[PDB]
Structure 1
Amino acid sequence: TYKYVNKKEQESEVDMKSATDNAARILMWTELIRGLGMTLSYLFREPATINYPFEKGPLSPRFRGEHALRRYPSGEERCIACKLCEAICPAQAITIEAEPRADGSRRTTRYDIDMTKCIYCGFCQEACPVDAIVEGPNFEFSTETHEELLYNKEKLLNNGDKWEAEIAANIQADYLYR
């Protein structure tokens, strides 16, 4: 179906009352007074402004911000160098080099992420079959230097050791929806 927005106008019938009403509208600026009234109403409303950085904007567990490599509760690393994360990373931001750890386990030596290439898409944490790489909630990690934004294994491991209390709970919340 369809409707008209500016064809409503029908044949012209005009009286003295209609003419006088249009004249008052044209001479006393009726329609503009109404915009003035709207802006006035907004002045006496509560502003939606939050007091950052004290009170902050809402978020959800699914928020995908800063990356971190997690561990099993034993302290062992979850990554096994399967390389799905870098195989799908559509920005080619991940870089991995694996090697048999002295104990024989399959682990990484290099795990680098150019956070100037990451598009923060989440494909790596939905590809990881061991829930090792995640995209944490932290977004307040700006820097004064480009180099600081080229994370390696130690940086991501430290982030994981810093946010686990939050990452784990957000996972526990969201992992049934996946």
Structure 2
Amino acid sequence: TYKYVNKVDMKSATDNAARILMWTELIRGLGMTLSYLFREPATINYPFEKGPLSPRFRGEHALRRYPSGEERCIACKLCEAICPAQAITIEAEPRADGSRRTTRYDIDMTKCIYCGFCQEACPVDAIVEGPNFEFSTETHEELLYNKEKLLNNGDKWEAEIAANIQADYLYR
């Protein structure tokens, strides 16, 4: 199936010259823009009415913490082996409880691509990618997040993260 897109009695000839001389056809465009100043602008008041998002929105990373208070990250290295931007370095140790935790964790947020391959690989739901997107910075150093700007970060949005995890866990 194919469709052609672009393929004289005086009545027609006068009609053609009534649409070329007394332009009547650029007028069907002027009335067309006059049809829009009288409509409601779509603009949202930005700072006060932030636009709509979804519980799936991938933004600023954060390290969730078990309700008890125990970091969820068990230093698998299942999240830099997949991070395609090669952004994460999670050097670990036994934490002197005999347990298994990070001494090091890192994202360089100037290399990350917010692909969420780290939140879907984590078998424990430690690293997530929160719904922040107002975290611009005046400097380069404030984007190389450490384990303590991700853990207290996750000690901030956990009321707001878990609702979205619980909201999308089934679909995932």
Which residue of structure 2 aligns with residue 10 of structure 1?
none
What is the rounded CA distance, in whole Å, between the counterparts of 1:170 and 1:29 in structure 2? 57
TM-fit CA distance, 1:102: 1.0
TM-fit CA distance, 1:30: 1.3
The C-alpha deviation readout for 1:128-166, integer Å capped at 9, x for no partner, is: 000000000000000000000000000000110000000
Find out whether 1:151 has 2:145 as its counterpart: yes
Find out whether 1:89 has 2:83 as its counterpart: yes
Which residue of structure 2 aligns with residue 33 of structure 1?
27
What is the rounded CA distance, in whole Å, between the counterparts of 2:78 and 2:64 in structure 1? 16
What is the rounded CA distance, in whole Å, between the counterparts of 2:171 and 2:23 in structure 1? 57
What is the rounded CA distance, in whole Å, between the counterparts of 2:22 and 2:43 in structure 1? 36
Percent of aligned pairs with the same amino acid: 99
What is the rounded CA distance, in whole Å, between the counterparts of 1:28 and 1:75 in structure 2? 78
TM-fit CA distance, 1:90: 0.1
TM-fit CA distance, 1:31: 1.2
The C-alpha deviation readout for 1:75-97, integer Å capped at 9, x for no partner, is: 10100000111110000001111
Q: Provide the secondary structure at the position in 1 that maps to 2:91.
A: strand
Which structure has the highest helix share of the two?
A: 1
- Give the TM-score, by structure 1 length: 0.95
What is the rounded CA distance, in whole Å, between the counterparts of 2:72 and 2:152 in structure 1? 14
The C-alpha deviation readout for 1:94-144, integer Å capped at 9, x for no partner, is: 111110011111100000100000001000000000000000000000000
What is the rounded CA distance, in whole Å, between the counterparts of 1:166 and 1:55 in structure 2? 18
- Give the TM-score, by structure 2 length: 0.98
TM-fit CA distance, 1:28: 1.1
What is the rounded CA distance, in whole Å, between the counterparts of 2:50 and 2:133 in structure 1? 12
Q: Provide the secondary structure at the position in 1 that maps to 2:52.
A: coil
TM-fit CA distance, 1:16: 1.3
What is the rounded CA distance, in whole Å, between the counterparts of 1:29 and 1:103 in structure 2? 86
The C-alpha deviation readout for 1:18-46, integer Å capped at 9, x for no partner, is: 11111100111111001100110011110
Structure 2: state its 5+ residue gaps: none
The match for 2:37 among 43, 46, 58 is 43
The match for 1:106 among 100, 105, 108 is 100
Q: Provide the secondary structure at the position in 1 that maps to 2:81.
A: helix
Which residue of structure 1 aligns with residue 160 of structure 2?
166
Which residue of structure 2 aligns with residue 3 of structure 1?
3
Structure 1 segments, 4+ long, off by >4 Å, are none
What is the rounded CA distance, in whole Å, between the counterparts of 2:131 and 2:171 in structure 1? 18
What is the rounded CA distance, in whole Å, between the counterparts of 1:63 and 1:88 in structure 2? 20
